[PDB]
Amino acid sequence: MPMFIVNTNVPRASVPDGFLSELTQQLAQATGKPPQYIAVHVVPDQLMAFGGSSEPCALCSLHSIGKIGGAQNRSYSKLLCGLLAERLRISPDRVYINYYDMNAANVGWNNSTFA
Amino acid sequence: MPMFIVNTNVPRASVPDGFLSELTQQLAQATGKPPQYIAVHVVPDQLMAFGGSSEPCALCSLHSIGKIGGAQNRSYSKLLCGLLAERLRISPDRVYINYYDMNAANVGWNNSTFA
Amino acid sequence: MPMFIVNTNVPRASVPDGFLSELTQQLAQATGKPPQYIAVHVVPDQLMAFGGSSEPCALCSLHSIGKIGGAQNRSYSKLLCGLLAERLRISPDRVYINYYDMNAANVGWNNSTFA
Numbered sequence: 001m002p003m004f005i006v007n008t009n010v011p012r013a014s015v016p017d018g019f020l021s022e023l024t025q026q027l028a029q030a031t032g033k034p035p036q037y038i039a040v041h042v043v044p045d046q047l048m049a050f051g052g053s054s055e056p057c058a059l060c061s062l063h064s065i066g067k068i069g070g071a072q073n074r075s076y077s078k079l080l081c082g083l084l085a086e087r088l089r090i091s092p093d094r095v096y097i098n099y100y101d102m103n104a105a106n107v108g109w110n111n112s113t114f115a
Numbered sequence: 116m117p118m119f120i121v122n123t124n125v126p127r128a129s130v131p132d133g134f135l136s137e138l139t140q141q142l143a144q145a146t147g148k149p150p151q152y153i154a155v156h157v158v159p160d161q162l163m164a165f166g167g168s169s170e171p172c173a174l175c176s177l178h179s180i181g182k183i184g185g186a187q188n189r190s191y192s193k194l195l196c197g198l199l200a201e202r203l204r205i206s207p208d209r210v211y212i213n214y215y216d217m218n219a220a221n222v223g224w225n226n227s228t229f230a
Numbered sequence: 231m232p233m234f235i236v237n238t239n240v241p242r243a244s245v246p247d248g249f250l251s252e253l254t255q256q257l258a259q260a261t262g263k264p265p266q267y268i269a270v271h272v273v274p275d276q277l278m279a280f281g282g283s284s285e286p287c288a289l290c291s292l293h294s295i296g297k298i299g300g301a302q303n304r305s306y307s308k309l310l311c312g313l314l315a316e317r318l319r320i321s322p323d324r325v326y327i328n329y330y331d332m333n334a335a336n337v338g339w340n341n342s343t344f345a
Contacts, residue, residue, distance in 0.1 A: 003289060003326060003328075005289070007156060012277075015277070020277070020278070020279040020284070021279070021282060024279060024282050035281060035282050036281035036282065037281065038280075038281060038282070039278065039279070039280045039281075039287065039289055039326055040278060040279045040280075041237060041276060041277070041278045041289055042277045042278070043276065043277065044277070046156060046158065047127075047130075047135070047156070047157045047158070047159070048135070048154065048155060048156040048157075049135040049136070049138075049139055049154070049155045050153075050154045050155075051139075051150060051151040051152065051153065051154075052136060052139045052140075052150050052151075052153070054135070057154070059118055059120075059154055059156060060223075062223075063328060068221070069220070070220050070228075073220055073221060073223060073228045074223075074227055074228055076223060077223035077224070077225075077226055077227050077228055078226045078227070080223065081223070081225065081226045082226070092224075092225045092226050093224065093225040095223075095224060095225070096116065096118060096154055096222060096223070096224055097222070097223030097224070098118075098178060098217065098221065098222060098223075099221040099222070099223065099228075100221070101221075102328065105299070105300040105303060105329075106298075106303065106328065106329040106330070107326060107327070107328060107329070108290075108303055108304075108306060108307030108310065108311075108325075108326065108327030108328075108329060109307070109323070109325065109326050109327070110307070110311065110322045110323040110325065111304075111307055111308045111311050111322055112304050112307055112308070113300070113303050113304050113307060113329075115300055115303075115304075122271060161271060161273065162242075162245070162250070162271070162272045162273065162274070163250070163269070163270065163271045163272070164250040164251065164254060164269070164270050165268075165269045166254075166265060166266040166267065166268065166269075167250075167251055167254045167255070167265050167266075167268070169250070172269070174233055174235070174269055174271055175338075183336075184335070185335045185343075185345060188335060188336060188338060188343045188345075189338075189342050189343050189345075191338065192338035192339070192341055192342050192343055193341050193342065195338065196338070196339075196340065196341045197341070207339075207340045207341050208339070208340040210338070210339065210340070211231075211233055211269055211337060211338065211339055212337070212338030212339070213233075213293060213332065213336065213337060213338075214335075214336040214337070214338065215336070
């Protein structure tokens, strides 16, 4: 709650310096969850293909306890695709984002679960 | 839409030229979705174990908006273990494939989500 | 059934050598499944942040055909958090574990599914 992972074939070097921070701040506002509970993971240099091609692309995941749904998913997308296009230079139609509404009894953290 | 990921301890150098393409082509045929929508991600050189042994193995996942189900999963398994076995030399009883039927509102793409 | 993945920013060199075996034996006991069926994947050196900081952290997931539940999970979290803290020196509050109960029809293995 929330975890954001980005897998992309864009090279390490193109990942901008405060990128993780940025994501964190942004996700913080978008979901309205406090930053310290936000986890962010970026994996560049991957061997991937999208629609058969090797041009820049990304497969992402957003996990959260609640705050996932129809319209919300639409804003996250915008926001997220927006950042990726902008920072990593990836075309949005070359991005997929999987959204997962996690149940609290199913998220372990510090010796227990959120249930 | 679909996204297929392969995580394996086989070395990068062992992945044949052409593999990403073959996978995109076979999955398109297998799920009946145009290739344009298929994303493929191969991750070699992983630190992994299956059954406590570090002989060659793989953990994969296939996510799709529909085209997932009892009989379909069975054929994807036959298809996919067959390729990993022939192209990557991984024994099929050392492979796990997780299948996810995704809901359209939960797949972000191109600044929005599907429907 | 079961598959355990750990993604962490700790360096590869800090991952003990019997770590995969250790996790394997411990999950076999915790889940009550024979070790033969346990898959473990450890991914160090990742680019991640937790709560905005880059101190050591881990994003994990545990997939099982059954044995997943409110209480089991609480117990798993303790075991897992204990292991990561001792072996990788990760602080338990900088760890998330996603729990997934999978349907047998959704898990491929050895050319077919468990269904």
